[PDB]
A = this chain, B = another copy of it.
Amino acid sequence: PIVQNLQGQMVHQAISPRTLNAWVKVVEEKAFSPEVIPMFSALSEGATPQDLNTMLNTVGGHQAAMQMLKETINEEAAEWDRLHPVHAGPIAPGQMREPRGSDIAGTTSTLQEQIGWMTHNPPIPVGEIYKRWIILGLNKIVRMYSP
């Protein structure tokens, strides 16, 4: 995640193993139950896309759901690209590039790039955009997996 250091700057720090394991354990115990979404939300505080793929990729089991989510993440990403067209002409030397759906999904962007966008002024909340897609896709799952 990207956290504020004592000095008063935003720097990246790694997520903790008993945080990781707590994510694992939630999924083990409460599967598709709604409490998973606030839980997720708390444990995703200050998290990167990269950390969010890590959390999704580290799941075991419920592979039908994991595929449905993936496909929702790509749909929501396809929709990001649709709604926000690429911008006019070449990229400025003085500036950094606008993200695509796949940069938001973490796929085409690097960590330093993910830190550029979030730490820069104005900052862009690429975590929160992926977060809604995850929560939206979580609703899809919850609604389906209701019996």
Contact = CB atoms under 8 A, between A and B. Distances in A.
A20 B59 CA distance: 21
A14 interface: yes
Nearest to A18: B17
A108 interface: no
Interface string A32-50: 0101001101110110000
A62 interface: no
B57 A38 contact: yes
Contacts of A18: 17-18
A39 B73 CA distance: 22
A4 B33 CA distance: 35
A80 B12 CA distance: 32
Given A17-B18, A17-B22, A58 B35 contact: yes
Contacts of A59: 35
Contacts of A60: 30, 33, 35
A139 interface: no
A145 to B, nearest CB: 15
Contacts of A57: 35, 38
A45 B1 CA distance: 13
Contact of A58 (B4, B20, B22, B39): B39
Contacts of A42: 14-15, 20, 54, 58
